[PDB]
Design an enzyme around this catalytic site. Structure first.
Site, PDB file in Angstrom:
ATOM      1  N   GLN A   1      -4.401  -2.814   7.221  1.00  0.00           N
ATOM      2  CA  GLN A   1      -3.336  -1.992   7.793  1.00  0.00           C
ATOM      3  C   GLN A   1      -3.206  -0.678   7.005  1.00  0.00           C
ATOM      4  O   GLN A   1      -3.073  -0.686   5.779  1.00  0.00           O
ATOM      5  CB  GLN A   1      -2.017  -2.780   7.797  1.00  0.00           C
ATOM      6  CG  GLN A   1      -0.888  -2.204   8.659  1.00  0.00           C
ATOM      7  CD  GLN A   1      -0.037  -3.313   9.259  1.00  0.00           C
ATOM      8  OE1 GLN A   1      -0.281  -4.493   8.990  1.00  0.00           O
ATOM      9  NE2 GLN A   1       0.961  -2.949  10.075  1.00  0.00           N
TER      10      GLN A   1
ATOM     11  N   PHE B   1       6.780  -9.015  -4.657  1.00  0.00           N
ATOM     12  CA  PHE B   1       6.960 -10.162  -5.527  1.00  0.00           C
ATOM     13  C   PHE B   1       5.984 -10.141  -6.728  1.00  0.00           C
ATOM     14  O   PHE B   1       6.115 -10.958  -7.646  1.00  0.00           O
ATOM     15  CB  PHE B   1       6.802 -11.488  -4.742  1.00  0.00           C
ATOM     16  CG  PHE B   1       5.532 -11.616  -3.928  1.00  0.00           C
ATOM     17  CD1 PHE B   1       5.577 -11.610  -2.538  1.00  0.00           C
ATOM     18  CD2 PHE B   1       4.300 -11.841  -4.521  1.00  0.00           C
ATOM     19  CE1 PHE B   1       4.430 -11.766  -1.763  1.00  0.00           C
ATOM     20  CE2 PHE B   1       3.117 -12.012  -3.759  1.00  0.00           C
ATOM     21  CZ  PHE B   1       3.168 -11.977  -2.370  1.00  0.00           C
TER      22      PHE B   1
ATOM     23  N   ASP C   1      -4.407 -15.208  12.125  1.00  0.00           N
ATOM     24  CA  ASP C   1      -5.036 -14.460  11.064  1.00  0.00           C
ATOM     25  C   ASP C   1      -4.702 -14.945   9.640  1.00  0.00           C
ATOM     26  O   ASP C   1      -4.755 -14.172   8.679  1.00  0.00           O
ATOM     27  CB  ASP C   1      -4.601 -13.007  11.167  1.00  0.00           C
ATOM     28  CG  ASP C   1      -5.791 -12.100  11.163  1.00  0.00           C
ATOM     29  OD1 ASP C   1      -6.629 -12.260  12.087  1.00  0.00           O
ATOM     30  OD2 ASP C   1      -5.889 -11.270  10.231  1.00  0.00           O
TER      31      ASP C   1
ATOM     32  N   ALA D   1      -8.148 -16.507   4.009  1.00  0.00           N
ATOM     33  CA  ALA D   1      -8.045 -16.916   2.585  1.00  0.00           C
ATOM     34  C   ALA D   1      -7.444 -15.787   1.785  1.00  0.00           C
ATOM     35  O   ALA D   1      -6.694 -16.034   0.871  1.00  0.00           O
ATOM     36  CB  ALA D   1      -9.420 -17.269   1.991  1.00  0.00           C
TER      37      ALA D   1
ATOM     38  N   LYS E   1       4.358  -0.635   5.459  1.00  0.00           N
ATOM     39  CA  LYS E   1       3.360  -0.902   6.486  1.00  0.00           C
ATOM     40  C   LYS E   1       3.669  -0.059   7.723  1.00  0.00           C
ATOM     41  O   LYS E   1       4.813   0.069   8.160  1.00  0.00           O
ATOM     42  CB  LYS E   1       3.315  -2.398   6.810  1.00  0.00           C
ATOM     43  CG  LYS E   1       2.413  -3.205   5.895  1.00  0.00           C
ATOM     44  CD  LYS E   1       2.993  -4.542   5.610  1.00  0.00           C
ATOM     45  CE  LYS E   1       1.902  -5.553   5.377  1.00  0.00           C
ATOM     46  NZ  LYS E   1       1.037  -5.818   6.563  1.00  0.00           N
TER      47      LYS E   1
HETATM   48 HG   LIG Z   1     -12.862 -14.566   0.970  1.00  0.00          HG
END
Ligand SMILES: [Hg+2]
Ligand SMILES: [Cl-]
Ligand SMILES: [Cl-]
Ligand SMILES: [Cl-]
Ligand SMILES: [Cl-]
Ligand SMILES: [Cl-]
Ligand SMILES: [Cl-]
Ligand SMILES: [Cl-]
Ligand SMILES: [Cl-]
Ligand SMILES: [Cl-]
Ligand SMILES: [Cl-]
Ligand SMILES: [Hg+2]
Ligand SMILES: [Hg+2]
Ligand SMILES: [Hg+2]
Ligand SMILES: [Hg+2]
Ligand SMILES: [Hg+2]
Ligand SMILES: [Hg+2]
Lengths: 401, 71, 71, 431
Positions: D149, D230, D303, D306, D175
């Site tokens: 983004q 965070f 979406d 990982a 964003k």
């Molecule tokens: Hg990855």
């Protein structure tokens, strides 16, 4: 009924003899929460229930004299109900090896020569041993002076008298100088950098041996008892742990590499001096805060060399109590057998060589330094027998190191 | 406090289990392994893997650290 | 504070290195194979407790059980 | 050459691009000794030598926006020697996700407040041919944010928004809206990605998931999402803005971004859940992570790759999950260009009958439970997850809707709610 178990005036838990005679033990919850907290024995882990395993009976059986005959005397003298641990310990269970004291739920040169005043074996097993209760007596002394305690109050010394003569079916072992013998062997061991207790001969002619499970107060005001147990207790036993089991165990010691090195070293020492009594029963650990452990000093060491020949026995009769390799005959055993053993045990070959090599180097001057520091009183047959038979097995190290 | 073998460790952890009076299955169920496995550990600690050990250790809500009283 | 076999092996490897020992120096010191030290460093999950403690003794460490940095 | 690697003014070691152009890293002896000590990444454990594995390149490469277009902008923005990690990071590596600050070796304000008016803010937010809102009339604003983004990061205390200078930390990720993805095989209405993430973050939080706070900001015609970081925090004496060490799963496992997808294929549920057994909150973390798989099925999040999960790295190299972030429903795309719920796939597949189940329309409590058991996640806990959603989902939706600003697009609320409510019907059927 119940015996309250204390360690140094600190409360550990309780031993119960049930109706059918079964022995059970339960830790106090203010024990399991002291900073002092440790198991009574590594065979009796800190835990919450009543413990009912054979380990409990054995543990407490292992605190009492082995001899069924010393057991009768205690029975006769104190009017005990039996020879069961609970019953014998509700009578003598105050001072014992290491620290445990058990409570029901409720002096003069001539009296000395006097205080120490009390054999035949069925078995052909050449028992040459200074570990018997039947010659022992825990005295107390910091002064120049011996004295009997009494109450809850610890001894400092174990006094050993001569064993004397021993007849099994097929031989007579003359152990009437076992006092001088142990004395020699203890200085030898010290000379060779083994940790062993300090001893003196006192005079009847007895061995005074300083206890290594007794230690004074920082404030120097109260003798403390140091928790320790033998390998029989450690393993839950009255077979018999050999070198492998013990060496495995010693990997968990808080001084694992030193204790493992010393212990192997001591197997070579006992080979060299003709010591045939190194049973499991005869090695011990300190139990420390948390139930971690360390080997104690080695103790109760006697050579069988002085009983060879004449009215006595042959060298082909001498067996190591814990064998190598399987190999037990002291006169069939060469450096090579120690190395086969170190290998099987994944004890570093290089550490085994080092041990074998330092004995090669050190034996002659050790023997000579010991000889120099003996009293003038000392029986020469004893020295001659040990020294000559040591130098002989030692020449097996020279052919090599 | 300092620990030097699989057995000493097993013992100390069994005791921690008990003091929270949990049971072997309460534990096993908390992490998703069969209660045997916990039993096999408390009784025969030597051949326990480190993966299994750190599971039981998570069950008891403990971690471990590495280290370097008158008797 | 340590919570997996991997985090354990890493901290132990770094103690090995801080010490200037090699995986062989270390395996020699306690009498096991180089391949077992290296199996532990690289995949520790399956390492048994008994091996771990041998490695730990030779590193001159013990361990403890547990229940002030800004970040 | 070398970039010195710092974490909050603690020195950690150096990244070296070698004469042949290969990236290696070496920790400082002072770091290894330090009370603060912990690995830069779990893929780069603490050690004495030079590390020269792929893990090194990948770590730093993962500090940077994934698009080559964005990268090409930074390159032009700063006459960067190139588009490789080492060169991008020598320009923008002062403020990144987590705590890494990269300082060229030969060679800064510690908290340098520097206000934005609003027309300026509109200009920073409008800045796309400029990378990460890093205006051309402005040095010492040198930030990196991963992800695809269009975005930027700002600092803010109190009420006004500033461009931070030097090694000053940002407090918010801003964003901007995605718009129309035309895929060879489809065309998607993400013009409204700011409202949609706003909404899904609110709902995650309503269902007791841990997620950052976010607000919608408007700067003239610009509508933006400002998400609270965070990986940033005030020290005790609220005198220093600390960065918190943190990495994504791509970093943790030593892998590129560009396998990210379980498809191509990256780490999935099993790998991640096995890793979380190692967390300093294993049981909490594994619970919430499984919880969030049901959540993403419920909201039509296709979406959750990982790269969308992260762990805080604590002293000593222990770790636990950060809040979840980057949450977007695909439900608002359905209908008008021919895509229906039958077309939506989970990023990480469940255990099925035989193989993995990724179709959101085909997935039922039964797959979650079969997955729990493969993974040795306690059955009683997975029932407890499936049942709390059964009970809470309709009220959570309503609470959320009521808290929405007056101008919130109805097409996003409706598309998400009605599709949620209907997958929910699979739960309350059983619970
Ligand atoms: Hg990855
Ligand atoms: Cl044996
Ligand atoms: Cl032979
Ligand atoms: Cl033989
Ligand atoms: Cl129990
Ligand atoms: Cl310590
Ligand atoms: Cl190395
Ligand atoms: Cl602690
Ligand atoms: Cl996976
Ligand atoms: Cl199916
Ligand atoms: Cl499917
Ligand atoms: Hg006295
Ligand atoms: Hg006295
Ligand atoms: Hg025994
Ligand atoms: Hg410690
Ligand atoms: Hg601790
Ligand atoms: Hg500011």
């Amino acid at each position: 009924p119940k015996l309250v178990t204390w360690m140094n005036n600190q409360r550990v838990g309780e031993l119960t003899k049930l109706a059918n005679g079964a022995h059970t033990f339960k830790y106090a919850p203010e024990w399991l929460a002291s900073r002092y907290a440790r198991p009574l024995s590594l065979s009796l882990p800190l835990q919450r229930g009543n413990i009912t395993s054979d380990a409990v009976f054995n543990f407490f059986d292992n605190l009492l004299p082995d001899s069924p005959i010393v057991r009768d005397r205690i029975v006769k003298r104190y009017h005990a109900k039996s020879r069961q641990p609970f019953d014998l310990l509700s009578e003598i269970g105050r001072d014992s090896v290491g620290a445990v004291t058990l409570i029901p739920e409720d002096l003069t040169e001539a009296r000395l020569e006097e205080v120490l005043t009390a054999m035949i074996r069925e078995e052909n097993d050449f028992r040459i041993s200074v570990a018997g209760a039947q010659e022992k007596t825990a005295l107390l002394r910091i002064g120049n002076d011996w004295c009997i305690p009494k109450g809850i109050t610890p001894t400092t010394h174990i006094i050993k008298l001569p064993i004397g003569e021993i007849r099994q079916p097929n031989a007579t072992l003359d152990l009437s100088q076992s006092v001088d013998n142990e004395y020699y062997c203890l200085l030898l061991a010290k000379e060779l950098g083994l940790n062993v207790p300090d001893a003196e001969i006192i005079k009847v002619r007895a061995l005074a041996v300083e206890r290594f499970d007794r230690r004074w107060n920082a404030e120097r005001t109260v003798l403390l008892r140091l928790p320790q147990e033998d390998m029989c207790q450690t393993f839950g036993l009255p077979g018999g742990p050999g070198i492998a089991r013990i060496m495995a165990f010693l990997m968990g010691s808080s001084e694992a590499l030193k204790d493992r090195y010393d212990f192997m070293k001591f197997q070579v020492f006992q080979w060299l001096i003709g010591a045939t009594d190194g049973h499991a029963k005869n090695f011990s650990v300190f139990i420390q805060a948390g139930g971690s452990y360390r080997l104690t000093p080695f103790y109760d060491i006697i050579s069988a060399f002085p009983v060879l020949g004449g009215t006595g026995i042959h060298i082909s009769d001498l067996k190591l109590a814990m064998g190598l390799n399987k190999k037990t005959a002291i006169d069939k055993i060469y450096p090579r057998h120690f190395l086969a053993t170190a290998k099987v045990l994944r004890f570093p070959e290089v550490q085994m060589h080092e041990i074998l090599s330092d004995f090669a180097r050190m034996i002659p001057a050790a023997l000579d330094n010991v000889k120099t520091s003996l009293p003038t009183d000392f029986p020469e047959n004893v020295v001659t027998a040990v020294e000559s038979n040591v130098l002989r097995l030692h020449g097996r190290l020279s052919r090599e190191y | 406090q300092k620990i030097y073998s699989p057995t000493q460790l097993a013992n100390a952890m069994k005791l921690v289990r008990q003091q929270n009076g949990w049971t072997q299955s309460e534990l096993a169920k908390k992490i998703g392994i069969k209660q045997a496995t916990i039993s096999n550990f408390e009784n025969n600690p030597d051949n326990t893997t480190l993966t299994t050990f750190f599971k039981i250790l998570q069950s008891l809500e403990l971690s471990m650290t590495l280290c370097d009283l008158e008797w």
